[PDB]
PDB file of C-alpha atoms in Angstrom:
ATOM      1  CA  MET W   1       0.000   0.000   0.000  1.00 27.77           C
ATOM      2  CA  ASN W   2       2.919   2.381  -0.661  1.00 28.08           C
ATOM      3  CA  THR W   3       3.993   3.735  -4.072  1.00 24.55           C
ATOM      4  CA  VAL W   4       7.658   3.060  -4.931  1.00 22.46           C
ATOM      5  CA  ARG W   5      10.119   5.794  -5.955  1.00 25.57           C
ATOM      6  CA  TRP W   6      11.541   5.018  -9.416  1.00 25.44           C
ATOM      7  CA  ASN W   7      14.795   6.676 -10.524  1.00 25.97           C
ATOM      8  CA  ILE W   8      15.850   6.405 -14.180  1.00 24.23           C
ATOM      9  CA  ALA W   9      17.871   8.555 -16.611  1.00 26.77           C
ATOM     10  CA  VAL W  10      16.767   9.017 -20.246  1.00 24.28           C
ATOM     11  CA  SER W  11      17.615  11.236 -23.240  1.00 23.86           C
ATOM     12  CA  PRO W  12      15.796  14.567 -23.337  1.00 21.14           C
ATOM     13  CA  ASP W  13      14.328  13.273 -26.627  1.00 23.35           C
ATOM     14  CA  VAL W  14      12.160  10.822 -24.674  1.00 22.07           C
ATOM     15  CA  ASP W  15      10.577  13.443 -22.380  1.00 23.05           C
ATOM     16  CA  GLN W  16       9.615  15.686 -25.318  1.00 22.90           C
ATOM     17  CA  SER W  17       7.990  12.715 -27.092  1.00 19.85           C
ATOM     18  CA  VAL W  18       6.024  11.816 -23.933  1.00 20.43           C
ATOM     19  CA  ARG W  19       4.506  15.317 -23.657  1.00 18.13           C
ATOM     20  CA  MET W  20       3.862  15.323 -27.420  1.00 21.99           C
ATOM     21  CA  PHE W  21       1.629  12.229 -27.169  1.00 20.10           C
ATOM     22  CA  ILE W  22      -0.631  13.781 -24.496  1.00 18.66           C
ATOM     23  CA  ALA W  23      -0.686  17.182 -26.246  1.00 18.76           C
ATOM     24  CA  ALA W  24      -2.168  15.462 -29.316  1.00 20.58           C
ATOM     25  CA  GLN W  25      -4.648  13.609 -27.073  1.00 19.56           C
ATOM     26  CA  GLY W  26      -5.331  16.636 -24.836  1.00 21.38           C
ATOM     27  CA  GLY W  27      -2.841  18.567 -22.670  1.00 21.22           C
ATOM     28  CA  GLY W  28      -4.349  18.575 -19.153  1.00 19.88           C
ATOM     29  CA  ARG W  29      -4.725  14.986 -17.883  1.00 16.98           C
ATOM     30  CA  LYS W  30      -5.112  14.089 -14.183  1.00 17.74           C
ATOM     31  CA  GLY W  31      -2.193  11.696 -13.567  1.00 20.18           C
ATOM     32  CA  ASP W  32       1.275  12.719 -14.805  1.00 25.41           C
ATOM     33  CA  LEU W  33       4.111  11.281 -16.929  1.00 24.82           C
ATOM     34  CA  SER W  34       4.801   8.618 -14.269  1.00 26.39           C
ATOM     35  CA  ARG W  35       1.402   7.047 -15.066  1.00 27.39           C
ATOM     36  CA  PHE W  36       2.111   6.997 -18.826  1.00 29.44           C
ATOM     37  CA  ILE W  37       5.136   4.693 -18.387  1.00 26.83           C
ATOM     38  CA  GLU W  38       3.535   2.707 -15.536  1.00 27.17           C
ATOM     39  CA  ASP W  39       0.643   1.551 -17.753  1.00 26.29           C
ATOM     40  CA  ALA W  40       3.069   0.929 -20.637  1.00 27.85           C
ATOM     41  CA  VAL W  41       5.241  -1.510 -18.644  1.00 26.68           C
ATOM     42  CA  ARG W  42       2.151  -3.301 -17.266  1.00 26.15           C
ATOM     43  CA  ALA W  43       0.888  -4.128 -20.785  1.00 28.50           C
ATOM     44  CA  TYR W  44       4.292  -5.442 -21.942  1.00 29.99           C
ATOM     45  CA  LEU W  45       4.968  -7.562 -18.830  1.00 29.93           C
ATOM     46  CA  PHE W  46       1.514  -9.176 -19.154  1.00 29.96           C
ATOM     47  CA  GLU W  47       1.874  -9.927 -22.886  1.00 35.97           C
ATOM     48  CA  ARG W  48       5.178 -11.770 -22.341  1.00 32.79           C
ATOM     49  CA  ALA W  49       3.578 -13.417 -19.283  1.00 35.20           C
ATOM     50  CA  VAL W  50       1.222 -15.602 -21.358  1.00 36.33           C
ATOM     51  CA  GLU W  51       4.228 -16.838 -23.372  1.00 36.86           C
TER      52      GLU W  51
ATOM     53  CA  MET U   1      24.807  15.367 -25.187  1.00 36.13           C
ATOM     54  CA  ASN U   2      23.641  15.017 -21.560  1.00 34.48           C
ATOM     55  CA  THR U   3      21.381  12.256 -20.184  1.00 30.11           C
ATOM     56  CA  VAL U   4      18.257  13.547 -18.398  1.00 32.54           C
ATOM     57  CA  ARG U   5      17.303  12.554 -14.836  1.00 31.74           C
ATOM     58  CA  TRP U   6      13.844  10.926 -14.835  1.00 33.05           C
ATOM     59  CA  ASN U   7      11.860  10.740 -11.580  1.00 31.41           C
ATOM     60  CA  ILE U   8       8.720   8.575 -11.460  1.00 27.97           C
ATOM     61  CA  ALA U   9       6.866   6.593  -8.768  1.00 24.86           C
ATOM     62  CA  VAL U  10       5.410   3.129  -9.487  1.00 25.10           C
ATOM     63  CA  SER U  11       3.948   0.172  -7.552  1.00 23.13           C
ATOM     64  CA  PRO U  12       6.504  -2.303  -6.225  1.00 19.33           C
ATOM     65  CA  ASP U  13       4.712  -4.825  -8.477  1.00 18.43           C
ATOM     66  CA  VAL U  14       6.214  -3.128 -11.541  1.00 18.68           C
ATOM     67  CA  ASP U  15       9.849  -3.351 -10.367  1.00 18.04           C
ATOM     68  CA  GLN U  16       9.556  -7.079  -9.589  1.00 21.33           C
ATOM     69  CA  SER U  17       8.082  -7.715 -13.060  1.00 21.76           C
ATOM     70  CA  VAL U  18      10.932  -5.759 -14.702  1.00 21.49           C
ATOM     71  CA  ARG U  19      13.620  -7.902 -13.027  1.00 23.64           C
ATOM     72  CA  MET U  20      11.591 -11.041 -13.805  1.00 23.20           C
ATOM     73  CA  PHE U  21      11.745 -10.356 -17.565  1.00 23.87           C
ATOM     74  CA  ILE U  22      15.563 -10.079 -17.601  1.00 24.46           C
ATOM     75  CA  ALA U  23      15.996 -13.061 -15.245  1.00 25.22           C
ATOM     76  CA  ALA U  24      14.156 -15.213 -17.807  1.00 27.82           C
ATOM     77  CA  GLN U  25      16.314 -13.730 -20.591  1.00 27.09           C
ATOM     78  CA  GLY U  26      19.535 -13.787 -18.527  1.00 27.52           C
ATOM     79  CA  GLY U  27      20.258 -11.955 -15.250  1.00 29.95           C
ATOM     80  CA  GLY U  28      23.472  -9.977 -15.883  1.00 33.40           C
ATOM     81  CA  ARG U  29      22.914  -7.455 -18.704  1.00 31.18           C
ATOM     82  CA  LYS U  30      25.129  -4.387 -19.268  1.00 32.18           C
ATOM     83  CA  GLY U  31      22.642  -1.488 -19.122  1.00 34.15           C
ATOM     84  CA  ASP U  32      20.163  -1.384 -16.215  1.00 33.49           C
ATOM     85  CA  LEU U  33      16.394  -1.049 -15.664  1.00 36.79           C
ATOM     86  CA  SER U  34      16.491   2.547 -16.966  1.00 36.54           C
ATOM     87  CA  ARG U  35      17.374   1.189 -20.433  1.00 39.35           C
ATOM     88  CA  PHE U  36      14.485  -1.319 -20.378  1.00 37.53           C
ATOM     89  CA  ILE U  37      11.866   1.460 -20.109  1.00 35.38           C
ATOM     90  CA  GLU U  38      13.805   3.860 -22.371  1.00 33.11           C
ATOM     91  CA  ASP U  39      13.642   1.452 -25.335  1.00 32.20           C
ATOM     92  CA  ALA U  40      10.003   0.640 -24.507  1.00 33.05           C
ATOM     93  CA  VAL U  41       8.852   4.280 -24.745  1.00 32.80           C
ATOM     94  CA  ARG U  42      10.847   4.815 -27.967  1.00 30.32           C
ATOM     95  CA  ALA U  43       8.987   1.986 -29.757  1.00 31.77           C
ATOM     96  CA  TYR U  44       5.547   3.252 -28.653  1.00 31.34           C
ATOM     97  CA  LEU U  45       6.187   6.926 -29.506  1.00 29.73           C
ATOM     98  CA  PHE U  46       7.388   5.927 -32.997  1.00 31.96           C
ATOM     99  CA  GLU U  47       4.420   3.616 -33.698  1.00 32.99           C
ATOM    100  CA  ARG U  48       1.899   6.374 -32.887  1.00 36.72           C
ATOM    101  CA  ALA U  49       4.117   8.772 -34.878  1.00 34.56           C
ATOM    102  CA  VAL U  50       3.270   7.193 -38.251  1.00 36.41           C
ATOM    103  CA  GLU U  51      -0.443   7.613 -37.434  1.00 39.59           C
TER     104      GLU U  51
END
């Protein structure tokens, strides 16, 4: 019941692309960038889970 | 020419799944977890880029 603190370094090209995706889909979502990657990793881990 | 510092919080269930994927594919890779998500976001941003 406690969120974990993730620390990762990436190229500034990745951050700009992340904001670009939301800007095309809106620009004022509730969650933040942390949620965008969190849901992305969940879908990949599950897909490889089946096989 | 300077890596960016990413700060994101996720459920401890995501970290365990990340290490599980590499353990099944090996267990001693060069890069670290930061590279696993970096390449994941690059593939998604490009796919939506075409359309």
